[PDB]
Amino acid sequence: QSPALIASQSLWRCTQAHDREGWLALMADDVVIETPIGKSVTNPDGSGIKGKEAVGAFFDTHIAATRLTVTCEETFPSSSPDEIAHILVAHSEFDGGFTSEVRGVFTYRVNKAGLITNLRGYWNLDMMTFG
Ligand SMILES: CC(=O)[C@@]1(O)CC[C@H]2[C@@H]3CCC4=CC(=O)CC[C@]4(C)[C@H]3CC[C@@]21C
Ligand code: NA
Ligand code: NA
Known part of the structure; x- marks a missing residue:
């Protein structure tokens, strides 16, 4: 298991389990989350959520x-x-x-310490469905 794979799998587990501290522990201090890439409710300015403090707020809001x-x-x-x-x-x-519900491509990058520096999602509203 590569550092990238372990990091992505761990993030899924912490996400579903609402494990806030475990979720943040996987992030680098300079992490940037772009889910999706481009402007959206979960990406207001379209340039991504930057820094552990901001992704902490992201977690509290959308997870x-x-x-x-x-x-x-x-x-x-x-x-x-x-x-x-x-x-x-x-x-x-x-x-x-x-x-x-939505389905898309998600790319992950980790630093040498094994912490997530980038998480980017490829989808748009057209690919979404609601119920
Ligand atoms: C509530 C919403 O708008 C969504 O459900 C629509 C798409 C969701 C992404 C999907 C990708 C993902 C994988 C991880 O490993 C961490 C958690 C995220 C970023 C997750 C957050 C909540 C999002 C943004
Ligand atoms: Na590094
Ligand atoms: Na660095």
Whole structure:
């Protein structure tokens, strides 16, 4: 298991389990999350959520109060142990019964310490469905 794979798998587990401190412990201090890449509700300025403090707020907003299910459809290693890509399906269920689901490419990068520096998602609203 490469550092990138272990990091991505650990982040899935901590995400579904709402494990805030475990989730943040996987992040580098200069982490940048772009889920999705470009402007969106989860990426306001379209340039990503930057720094552990900001992704902490991101967690509290979009993960903490949501039942999340992350399915790994397919994994694409690179020739670098520090970078990996996944086809993921992210299903959200909020307090009330409202749901959203999306499927896209997610790329991960870790530093030499094995901490996530980049998480980037390839999808848009057209690929989303709601229930
Ligand atoms: C509530 C929402 O809008 C979403 O459910 C739609 C897509 C979701 C991504 C999917 C990718 C992912 C994989 C991880 O390993 C960490 C958690 C994230 C970033 C996760 C956060 C919540 C998001 C943004
Ligand atoms: Na590094
Ligand atoms: Na550095």
